[PDB]
Design a protein around this ligand. Structure first.
Ligand SMILES: O=P(O)(O)CP(=O)(O)O[C@@H]1[C@@H](OP(=O)(O)O)[C@H](OP(=O)(O)CP(=O)(O)O)[C@H](OP(=O)(O)O)[C@H](OP(=O)(O)O)[C@H]1OP(=O)(O)O
Ligand SMILES: O=P(O)(O)CP(=O)(O)O[C@@H]1[C@@H](OP(=O)(O)O)[C@H](OP(=O)(O)CP(=O)(O)O)[C@H](OP(=O)(O)O)[C@H](OP(=O)(O)O)[C@H]1OP(=O)(O)O
Ligand SMILES: O=P(O)(O)CP(=O)(O)O[C@@H]1[C@@H](OP(=O)(O)O)[C@H](OP(=O)(O)CP(=O)(O)O)[C@H](OP(=O)(O)O)[C@H](OP(=O)(O)O)[C@H]1OP(=O)(O)O
Ligand SMILES: O=P(O)(O)CP(=O)(O)O[C@@H]1[C@@H](OP(=O)(O)O)[C@H](OP(=O)(O)CP(=O)(O)O)[C@H](OP(=O)(O)O)[C@H](OP(=O)(O)O)[C@H]1OP(=O)(O)O
Ligand SMILES: O=P(O)(O)CP(=O)(O)O[C@@H]1[C@H](OP(=O)(O)O)[C@H](OP(=O)(O)CP(=O)(O)O)[C@H](OP(=O)(O)O)[C@H](OP(=O)(O)O)[C@H]1OP(=O)(O)O
Lengths: 361, 363, 370, 368
């Protein structure tokens, strides 16, 4: 029972059908956009219909009594002709049969040098504005003299904001633990902190087992041990904005007294659900939408300038130790890991729905 | 030479006189409705006459949805207390009309919208809606212990306007900056837009200064500047209208690696629009004194929904760029700058009165 | 039980009484000098007695014999007549009324006011290492008798005079500056990675003897170790009359025990108390009095009033917290410089606030050390 | 004859002597720093004296009741030993041999070389209107003495040290090809009628103080009038470390008298000289030194070497000729249109080229 997503132009001349809202990037390759356009042949007589895939970085938000700063960089544009008709997929063949002889297929492919769906709406505390990377599928009709005035009439056009979602690659090597250790000399006596994760890549919703090994050879007491998942966001187009937000936290009970050692494994789950405040954090969609999650770790390909990703998103485990004096001192350290969606999957019956995404309560 | 507006009940028992058709809202306060009722003392014997001010939102062409936003009522007959006029207009009208003339004062609060209404075009989904202001003078009587009655024939209703005039304050000089980097181009196209001020008056020309800095290898073929009216119905139905009420297409092109500064002047006017449907007006399409609706001014700590219809204006600047549309984009290169549109600031022996029917002139 | 300070002239003809040795400047206004002069009416017969308030900057040693050894700039002079009694002659303040009653009918009041454009008690005696000489701002209260001779020359004998070196002490205003904060970062030669130092104090004004909590946040993203974190209170002294002398001296230092290893951060609060007591060597530092005296402290921060030329302050005194980070494999290898930042703060004394009082009398001369 | 620049440590134990304040970068190579250190052998007994060359980018300024934001990136560090005399600078120069003879046997030579990947002396103090802070690239020559346990306590005592802020000045290379005119043209269609603007400079590289002849050729085939022709030298400054600050300032301007009426053409040559002297306001512009100093000029054009990331230059400085044409409104308007175009050029100092007689001066630079 395959759910198909449809949207219709104002003038009802062009209707677009997609198999998915979300298209999978699994590093090796990206799932292409295969869909169909249903034209009203009366309302398209002597007209040409195209479908475009645009990836664009945007920066700026509407503020009263504040100068309107807007900025757009297109990171990819591609366009094909659907009408008049110029290999097909099985989804297209099936949709054409179900919809009629006014149905025409399109295939738009993604390249390997694009980011995934990342966007950010700032909090009151934050300097810097709303920014994001959008993916638009737009089907539109041109007239014969419309190309001659360079005009693309709105009522004959339909646009869909699809997501490019980061999944893990399908074949992966065995995963080395993500582990570091530090020796904090205090009065020439070492306080040793070792932090270790089970693996390097975790999935959204998957629990992260953080093993913390405090070896205290000092005459000071470790009063408190806090473990965070921090999300680090670097806007690398237009404005060098920096965000660092806790998306999961555990403050253990333990003290580590002088000349003793303590090993402890806390489990954290970095989830958007944990965060009442959904602003100041990199998401893969709008705050209002239900299917919106935390942004996956940016995966910069070799010999690609990171600036063309628009927004860099990374995750790290932060361990804060509160150490006594005779006011106390805090030491902290970071262990990086990557967060993304699971590996992808190794007649018909179509139910049709509006593309518009569901909201929250 | 003060023109006074009069209307008489069917039964000629109640006649209402107003100084104005239109009452000024200038944000700080709203001009109250000061008028007089002339009763035929024979035809109101043993009867009570009241005057009411009702503000209501309506939606539909039978009668589909009504929300009352304000109601107030006073007694004119028999005379309440002192019964002496409050304003000079009343004192003067009482003297000119006779001892059967009785004053009324109905005040506006600060939480109401101004006269806004909308009749949709064929292309538009959603129905006729508006905010009406009714001044109604009517007589009540009793022929039974069990009920009072309000005959229609003893009543007279006037549809006044609450017109938005400018405050003392103005917002900061509105300015926008936008830049685009098109696919495979290392070079930005920069658009800066500036207006002289934040508040313009109906009929006043709007000087839109446009600064196109073209560092690209493409040509800016066209620069179009619009005044767009944005209408949001915020009661019953979330209807949205966006209509051009003024447009100017500059002659200049901006070639590669050049910049052009240019000031286009627009005047957003109802007169510019043959099609008077699909746009927020301050009155009915048929009436002569009807204009474009003024910008809604929502007061602090007032829920916008009680305004019924939100009206805003913006300058839109569209750049048509060579060899993208089809090749490198399916989108439009445009930015918006908001501004407010309303009527000018207010100006801050006896008179000579000419009397006219309240009914408004047509086209 | 109010202690009153008295000094008597050599010839015992003029005795001066003050409520205080030290008079409070709290920025808004300055405490005036209210005192009384007790004359021996036999020894002042046909004579006039005056009291003067002089503020003067000096540079050099004190003039000896006839030699001008010193450079002197008078910053303020005022004088009043105490004898014979001027007009009403009745006390102005309660301290005067009370002293007159206790001492007798040969007691006469004086009031000398301070203006708003003067510095506070600041002086400096240089160390061997220092170039530049002894300098200071003195405040002299001098009561003296004049008489006339047969030739029309008036005389002012030293034996008929008494001079007191009072202090003008800086107490805090009502206002305080914003919480002082600094941020510094370094990227060393051949390093892609910053070393970030953030420094914060609890407040902008501290009092003499009050502990200063210096919060230090070292974020070390480098592959080098922060071997040492040293926190100083530095006193910066600028002589702005006669000679452009400059002194910068540590008056408090704390060396934290913690190191900050590669790819770690450390937040830490060290407490310092800038005190003259901490300094064995009392030379090369701005004091509010002489080294030998007990009640002598560090000079308060100079507070220059708006539209007053700083040169008329004579000696400018300021304080700052300096944080020095010692980083492994730099000094000699990647830098010949120091990794440090400064945060300014002001140091001064705390804010100010039917029967007679009970008076104990003491010599004005200040106590010394042991 | 030869003026030598000297500075002495507080404790008079170390004195440094340099041939120049300013060392020439002419793209091919950079003039090395050859000098001598005069030690007081009593005050350096059992001590080691070094001389370092540091190039550092700095960002931030002291503001009252404002948080102190400071940032330093070292772009080059090098150090040699002068005392005791175990030879480090290798072979000697004639300037050193001569200074050693004139000063005595307590004089020791040092040679510190510049690499090819450094910027030249550039710094900037912002104006009120400007958003970002003071920044610059400094070049420090520092001679300092260490004790035997000073290296062990990581301490460099200030009184035993002397630091000089030298300049790295951008001169033109010695061999250059013949110079093509720097010329562009634009066609501004107005109502489908072209307004043609051609701008031409004599050459691509000009020297500080050299006049720039800007030839402007307006061919007006439109029905509009060119009311005004303004020609500027604009300095464009991009801070490319810590903060992406941008400055664009006029350092020379000429507003011609001429109008160009409909269906006519006008050629005209204005001469501009971009000079710091022209600018009362010395803030918001890239200089090669401090505002207060006399020998301070406008910063030379940054010259980015092949395969060098521009970010390691710290501050990018470029110059351009801007031509603004004011074109009339047509049928009785109350505002006219401005079109403008830029022509880039580079600004720098001219190409470079027995016992001497030495006069000694304090290194400290003269003021205004
Ligand atoms: O987020 P969803 O789209 O699932 C909810 P909704 O319908 O309200 O979204 C509208 C969207 O309309 P459409 O569904 O694409 O036809 C608008 O799009 P259109 O009317 O189709 C085209 P537009 O951008 O208005 O020119 C525009 O979309 P977007 O720019 O935010 O993606 C609005 O944005 P804005 O008015 O807040 O600026 C956005 O509003 P919002 O989501 O905040 O309610
Ligand atoms: O509208 P106001 O009362 O403020 C002043 P006016 O005298 O002009 O109003 C009459 C109206 O009178 P009333 O409501 O019976 O007192 C008519 O009312 P009636 O014919 O008696 C029906 P109503 O009383 O409105 O329920 C009818 O009202 P409407 O059609 O505009 O609603 C007329 O319009 P139309 O006959 O030209 O179409 C309308 O005149 P308009 O100014 O709109 O031209
Ligand atoms: O829904 P609304 O009424 O608000 C918009 P509408 O359909 O009227 O507008 C287009 C307009 O472009 P746009 O849709 O506003 O962007 C066209 O604009 P273009 O001249 O093609 C270029 P634009 O899209 O404005 O940049 C041109 O009108 P106009 O804007 O020139 O007045 C069209 O008219 P036509 O000459 O193709 O028949 C006109 O359509 P029509 O008047 O037929 O309904
Ligand atoms: O120019 P500034 O005043 O800012 C520093 P300078 O080189 O003059 O001061 C040093 C000081 O160095 P620093 O304060 O850590 O930079 C020494 O300190 P370190 O090199 O850190 C020795 P430490 O291990 O801290 O005792 C030690 O001063 P300190 O120890 O009393 O603070 C010295 O004095 P000494 O006791 O060796 O004669 C003292 O010399 P002085 O200025 O008195 O001539
Ligand atoms: O700059 P020149 O040497 O040409 C003139 P001057 O003798 O007045 O130099 C002072 C002085 O430098 P030095 O180390 O004693 O030679 C200062 O020296 P310190 O601040 O005491 C040197 P330190 O901190 O010990 O390294 C500081 O030197 P610097 O800024 O050039 O490094 C001043 O600069 P700043 O603080 O105003 O910016 C600097 O210039 P000023 O502005 O006072 O005229």
């Amino acid at each position: 029972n395959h759910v198909i997503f449809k949207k219709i132009s104002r003038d009802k001349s062009v209707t677009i059908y997609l198999g998915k809202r979300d298209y999978i990037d699994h590093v090796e390759r990206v799932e292409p956009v295969d869909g169909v356009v249903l034209v009203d042949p009366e309302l398209v007589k002597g007209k040409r219909v195209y479908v475009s895939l645009t990836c664009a970085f945007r920066y700026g938000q509407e503020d009263i009594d504040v100068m309107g700063l807007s900025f757009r960089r297109d990171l990819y544009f591609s366009q094909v002709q659907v009408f008049p008709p110029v290999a097909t997929t099985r989804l297209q063949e099936s949709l054409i049969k179900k919809l009629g002889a006014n149905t025409y297929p399109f295939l738009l492919t993604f390249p390997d040098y694009l980011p995934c769906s990342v966007m950010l709406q700032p909090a009151p505390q934050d300097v810097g504005k709303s920014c994001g990377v959008d993916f638009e599928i737009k089907a539109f009709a041109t007239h014969s003299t419309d190309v001659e005035e360079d005009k693309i009439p709105k009522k004959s056009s339909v646009r869909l904001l699809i997501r490019k979602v980061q999944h893990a690659p399908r074949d992966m090597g065995p995963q080395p633990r993500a582990e570091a250790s530090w020796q904090f000399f205090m009065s020439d006596k070492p306080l040793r902190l070792a932090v270790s994760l089970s693996k390097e890549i975790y999935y959204h919703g998957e629990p992260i087992p953080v093993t913390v090994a405090v070896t205290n050879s000092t005459e000071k007491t470790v009063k408190k041990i806090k473990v965070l998942v921090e999300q680090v966001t670097n806007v690398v187009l237009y404005s060098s904005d920096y965000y660092i937000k806790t998306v999961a936290a555990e403050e253990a009970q333990e003290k580590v007294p002088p000349n003793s050692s303590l090993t402890k494994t806390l489990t954290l789950v970095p989830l958007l659900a944990n965060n009442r405040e959904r602003r100041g954090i990199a998401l893969d969609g709008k705050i209002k939408h239900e299917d919106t999650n935390l942004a996956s770790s940016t995966i910069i390909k070799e010999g690609i300038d990171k600036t063309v990703m628009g927004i860099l998103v990374s995750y790290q485990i932060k361990v804060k130790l509160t150490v006594s004096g005779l006011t106390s001192s805090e030491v902290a350290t970071e262990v990086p890991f990557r967060l993304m969606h699971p590996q992808p999957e190794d007649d018909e019956n179509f139910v049709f729905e509006e593309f518009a995404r569901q909201n929250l309560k």
